[PDB]
Structures are given as structure tokens and as C-alpha cells.
Structure 1
Amino acid sequence: PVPSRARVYTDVNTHRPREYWDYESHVVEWGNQDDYQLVRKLGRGKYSEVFEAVNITNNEKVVVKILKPVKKKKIKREIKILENLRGGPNIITLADIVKDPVSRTPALVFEHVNNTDFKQLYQTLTDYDIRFYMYEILKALDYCHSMGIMHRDVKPHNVMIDHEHRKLRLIDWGLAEFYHPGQEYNVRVASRYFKGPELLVDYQMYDYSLDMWSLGCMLASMIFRKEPFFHGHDNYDQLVRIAKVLGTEDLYDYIDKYNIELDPRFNDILGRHSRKRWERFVHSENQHLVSPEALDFLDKLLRYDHQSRLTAREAMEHPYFYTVVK
């Protein structure tokens, strides 16, 4: 396996004090439990129950995430990432961190954002709406990459949209990591439909560009109205359905370039496939969302070679966003 480096923000953490990325030695400063009053449940998560609440101290609208017991190392990482990124554009802000003195169980308190069900939301988005919100997610990603942090779970579930106020937040940093040039990460880190080829072929020296693939998947679902775009049945099958769109030739070039040991179990399932034109996924029900610049932007995000992909700031430059600059 040939080593790899991020083309941007390569050395952010290299020139940052230990205290910035050494989340393990980070000490949490707790708030008061009794400062918060629960109002409504917002639904079950896999690792937390989420409640609508109010800070009775200053009457601020809050959301509290009551955590299920999980390894504390993981939550310390999330907290330190949240703290390092606070104030950033379209980054959810951690307001406070509290603990229940009777049950010991911790809970994270975030700013309230009024979220619309994304399933019904993408169904009504205008051409401008896709560009605008895409430009907003980009803001959060460039910011967080510039702070030496990969999100690693970019997907519609983790994007809070308040449509009436056209306000967007990137949430759920529980999988996020600090980028260190040369470091090998574990690849079991995204949601299936949003995993980058680098994860699926078990290439460990990845970077911020992973998020840009995921953001690519989101764009493909929005402009084509096919959510999710790559609907694989498992990790192996996920690559196959990517290969069915991007082609097997560029996939094999990708492994060769990085001297990747492709899992022997891929031998009978990949086959041969050609690069499809993006205009093939265009029909009369989604046509109004698709423009030449949209298809160019997408093609420059969905590529096997993670180094080839547009960086977040390079993506903000694209023709596709020329109207959303006002």
C-alpha cells in the first residue's frame, strides 16, 4: 500500500499544541443537571434518546442528547471535536455537558434547531435550494477540515435543516477524527450508502476527502431524486453498485495506483462495467434540478481516487454555486 497525503490542510495538527488533538487527556467541565427542564421526546437514536428542552436559567431553547452507556474515550473525542469547532459556520454548537447525579449517565446539550423530516424535504427542493444548502454544508466541511478534523459520517440524517429560516447545521460528530499526515485509520467509520471506495477496499491512509465523497452521494440523491443513490445491500455490494456507475476500469486503476490488496472476495462480484454518463440518470421528473454545471460538480466529487476529488473550498468555487454568492 502506497502512502497518501491530504492535498489541503495536511499539517494543521502537526503545528498544533498537544492539548488540541489529545482528546484522551481532555478534562470535561460539567454543568448543572437541574439547570435544564425536559419538555418533549424527539425520538430514539441508536446511542442516545433525544429530548426537546429549555434552559430554565436564561430561557434558551435547547436540545439534550441523553447518552446510552458507551466507552468514555469515544464521547471525550466527540466533546473535544465539538469544542474545537464551536463558533464555526453551520457547525452545531455544544451549549453544555451535564450528568445525572443519581444515575451517573451523561447527556450533551446542543442548540435547538427545528428540523424537517429530510425524507419529505428533498421531495420539494428547488434547483436553487439544492445549490444553497450544498453551499451551506460545504461551509461546515471546509471549516472543519481547516481545523484538522474529518467528520466521517456525512449523510442527510446528520444535516439539520430549518427551512423556514433557511438555516443548516452539521451534527453527530461521534465518528469524527483528527487528521494526522501519514496516520492509518480504521475504515469501519461511515454509513454504508455514503462510504468512500477507499473504505470499501480497506485503504487506511485516508483524509478529509472521504467527506467529499459522502457529500457527492448526497448531491446525487438530491439532483436525481433517488435517495440513497448507491443502494448497496452490504459493504461488498456497495462497491459493486458504485462500479456499475463509475466503471470497473477506473476502480482497478485505483487499486494499482495505491498498490491496494483487494479482498479476494471481490473477484466474483465486481465483473466488468463501463463509466455511465450522468445524463443517463436524468428523467423528466428530476430534469429541473439537473444542469450542465451540476453534473460537472458531481463528476468531480464522485471519483475513486480520493486525491482527485475536489476539496471543500475548491468545490465552493465551482460554477454551480455562482448565484448563491449574494
Structure 2
Amino acid sequence: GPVPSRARVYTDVNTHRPREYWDYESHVVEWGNQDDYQLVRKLGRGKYSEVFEAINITNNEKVVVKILKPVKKKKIKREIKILENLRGGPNIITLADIVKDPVSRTPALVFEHVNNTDFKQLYQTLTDYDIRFYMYEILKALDYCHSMGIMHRDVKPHNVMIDHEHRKLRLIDWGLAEFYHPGQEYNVRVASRYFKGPELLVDYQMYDYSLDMWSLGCMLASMIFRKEPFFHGHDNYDQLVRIAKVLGTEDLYDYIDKYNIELDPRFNDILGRHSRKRWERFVHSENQHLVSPEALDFLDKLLRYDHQSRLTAREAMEHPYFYTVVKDQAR
């Protein structure tokens, strides 16, 4: 069978916590009063929830209400417990309340309101500095959650709220997040296709915080190269092919060998033989102003097959890409 794996960092953070911290199945949900909120306008629907701007009638405060679509008690408890454990951490969305929505008979999560600009409009306006700055802000949230024993498992533009005017960022949507326990075999059916790590695509279950760093690298590539998505697969199998056309097949097969991974037989014909491509292949007149040696070196060190080889959040924050931003924030 496959060779086991452990996180390089924060390996045993949960092992030393009280059981209650990570044992979300045991959590008893603390309900507030649904009548404290009035819905104002619908912001969007997902597979898992519908989101509204709302108002707390008592405090006259703007809030956001996420009405949960029906999922197992355990899934709701996991998201609640994680949000509560992380509350107040850097750039983590603040869970203000949990209420019972009367019509749905489902829970509703009540969050702080972020004055977000839709990424589809914002990302084109972002300068070189802006990308560095917001990447650093995401890394603060990821280092925090990782240090707290939690994997996000769904890092993507949709889940990063940016109030541009205030240079304010929040990481949202902890509905897929999980506690890291060394040796645990996780569900590979997580995250969004274009951002899935190689570990997920080859069905390597003993993954860790490093998954988030692959997803982040996918985001960085899409931003600096003006290419959304960066890895555009048609399906889950083709997704690995798209990655292999860039990172090359030699390193892919090296990863599979190192972990003794059993490759799905579907994969063989389509995978072929591909060189590792130079990042400069993706540079053009429209994106060159965003691309530096620094940016490419950093990206190279996130987008690695071998989860153990990728930069940590904490390592990434020390990269030369960020020297200007670190200086400007100690102003």
C-alpha cells in the first residue's frame, strides 16, 4: 500500500489540545435568536448555502447570513467548531451568531459584513504591489489556521473577501475545512477542480496543510499570468493532465514512486510524456508588469507535486517577493 505521510509543521497541534477542541461530533450547538436579524438582499446561492446581507435589528449592525442547505449534523458541527476555534485570528471571518432559520428548519450562520469587491472586477485592477499585499494577508490567515490544526481545503478567489478601500481581507467558507491528525486518511473529494492538489487527483489520502499551499499557488498563477483558471481541466483525470503538461511527467511519476501510490488505470494513456515548462512560457504583453523573478521563484516553490516539498505558509511569508510589503507594514 501507500507510504504514510506527516505534516512538516504543526504536526501534533491537535494531539495536545483538549479532546473537545477537535472532536466536533461531540459539539453542542449554541443557538441564538433568529428574530434578531432581518434579511435585506440576497448575495448569491451555492451548492451548500444561500447568502444574504442582513441587519441585526437590536444593534442596527449590517451582517451576512448564510442559510445552510441540508447536510449531515456532523458537517455543520465541523464548520461551526472550526469557526469558533479560529474566531479572532488574523484575517479569519468572524462568526457572530448561529440561529435556526424557521422556514428552512436549517441552521443559519451570521457573519461580520465585509464590503467585498467581486474578484471578477477587482483582480484586473490589482497592481504588482496589490497582489503581493493581498497574498501576504491570505498567508497570515493560512499560517494561523494551520498553526491551529485546521486545513481550509477550499482556498480560491471566491472564498477571499477583499474590501479594497480598506486594504482588508477575510478568508471565508470553512464548510470544507478539517482538523489535521497525523495518519488520518482524508476524503480526496474536496476543493474545486482547478485548485485540487495532485494528492487529491491521484487519491493519496494522508494529505495535510500543504494542500492549501497548492491551491494558493493556483491562485497566484491565475493572478500574475491573467489566466483564470491556470490549470483548466475538463474533468478530474484531465485536471492531472493539465498539471503534467506544465510541471512535467518525470516529477509526477517520481512523486507516485516515492509514496508507492497506485495510479488509477484510466490515467495511463492520457498522461503521456511532457517536459517541465519554463514559467516564462506564460508571460506576455498583458501580464508582464505583474511577473518578476521573485514571483516566479515563489510560485515554483508552491506548485510542487510532492506536498512535503511545498513552502509552508510560514516559509512563504519570508520569501523575497514580500520584502517591500513587510517593510511598508512596519512604517
TM > 0.5 fold call = yes
Aligned equivalent of 1:275:
276
What whole-Å deviation, never above 9, does each CA across 1:205-246 have from its counterpart, x for those lacking one? 000000000000000000000011000001100000000000
Structure 2 counterpart SS, 1:184: coil
Distance 1:105 1:249, change over 3 A: same
What whole-Å deviation, never above 9, does each CA across 1:117-162 have from its counterpart, x for those lacking one? 1112111110001000000000000000000000000011111111
Deviates more, 1:114-123 or 1:258-267: 114-123
Displacement of 1:114 in angstroms is 1.4
Aligned equivalent of 1:161:
162
Give the Cα separation in 2 of the matches to 1:40 and 1:214.
31
Give the Cα separation in 2 of the matches to 1:60 and 1:153.
29
Displacement of 1:104 in angstroms is 2.5
Give the Cα separation in 2 of the matches to 1:46 and 1:305.
31
Deviates more, 1:211-220 or 1:108-117: 108-117
Displacement of 1:100 in angstroms is 3.0
Give the Cα separation in 2 of the matches to 1:126 and 1:91.
24
Structure 2 counterpart SS, 1:322: helix
Structure 2 counterpart SS, 1:267: helix
Give the Cα separation in 1 of the matches to 2:204 and 2:105.
39
Displacement of 1:72 in angstroms is 1.5
Alpha carbons 2:115, 2:163 under 8 Å: kept: yes
Alpha carbons 2:151, 2:179 under 8 Å: kept: yes
Displacement of 1:67 in angstroms is 1.5
Alpha carbons 2:196, 2:215 under 8 Å: kept: yes
Deviates more, 1:296-305 or 1:32-41: 32-41
Give the Cα separation in 1 of the matches to 2:244 and 2:121.
29
Alpha carbons 2:67, 2:101 under 8 Å: kept: no
Displacement of 1:275 in angstroms is 0.4
Aligned equivalent of 1:209:
210
Moved over 6 A (4+): none
Give the Cα separation in 2 of the matches to 1:265 and 1:83.
42
| TM-score, normalised via structure 1 length | 0.98
Deviates more, 1:2-11 or 1:42-51: 42-51
Give the Cα separation in 2 of the matches to 1:101 and 1:241.
45
Aligned equivalent of 1:27:
28
Displacement of 1:294 in angstroms is 0.4
Give the Cα separation in 1 of the matches to 2:286 and 2:261.
40
Structure 2 counterpart SS, 1:232: coil
Give the Cα separation in 2 of the matches to 1:103 and 1:8.
41
Give the Cα separation in 2 of the matches to 1:121 and 1:144.
25
Structure 1 counterpart SS, 2:97: strand
Distance 1:24 1:124, change over 3 A: same
Displacement of 1:70 in angstroms is 1.7
What whole-Å deviation, never above 9, does each CA across 1:187-206 have from its counterpart, x for those lacking one? 00110000000000000000
Structure with more helix by fraction: 2
Displacement of 1:325 in angstroms is 1.2
1:72-151 mapped onto 2 (5 Å cutoff): 72-101=73-102, 103-151=104-152
Give the Cα separation in 1 of the matches to 2:120 and 2:101.
34
Give the Cα separation in 1 of the matches to 2:89 and 2:261.
36
Alpha carbons 2:226, 2:287 under 8 Å: kept: yes
What whole-Å deviation, never above 9, does each CA across 1:9-35 have from its counterpart, x for those lacking one? 000011111000000100111100111
Deviates more, 1:232-241 or 1:35-44: 35-44
The alignment's C-alpha RMSD in Å is 0.9
What whole-Å deviation, never above 9, does each CA across 1:34-90 have from its counterpart, x for those lacking one? 111111111222221111111111122200011222212101100000000000001
| TM-score, normalised via structure 2 length | 0.97
Aligned equivalent of 2:16:
15
What whole-Å deviation, never above 9, does each CA across 1:261-313 have from its counterpart, x for those lacking one? 01111110000000000011001110000001000000000000000000000
Structure 2 counterpart SS, 1:51: strand
Give the Cα separation in 1 of the matches to 2:57 and 2:118.
28
Give the Cα separation in 1 of the matches to 2:242 and 2:52.
37
What whole-Å deviation, never above 9, does each CA across 1:93-115 have from its counterpart, x for those lacking one? 10000013465221110000111
Structure 2 counterpart SS, 1:173: coil
Give the Cα separation in 2 of the matches to 1:260 and 1:50.
40
Alpha carbons 2:88, 2:94 under 8 Å: kept: yes
1:277-292 mapped onto 2 (5 Å cutoff): 277-292=278-293
Deviates more, 1:201-210 or 1:97-106: 97-106
Give the Cα separation in 1 of the matches to 2:164 and 2:104.
37
Distance 1:102 1:213, change over 3 A: closer
* Identity of matched residues, %: 100
Displacement of 1:317 in angstroms is 0.3
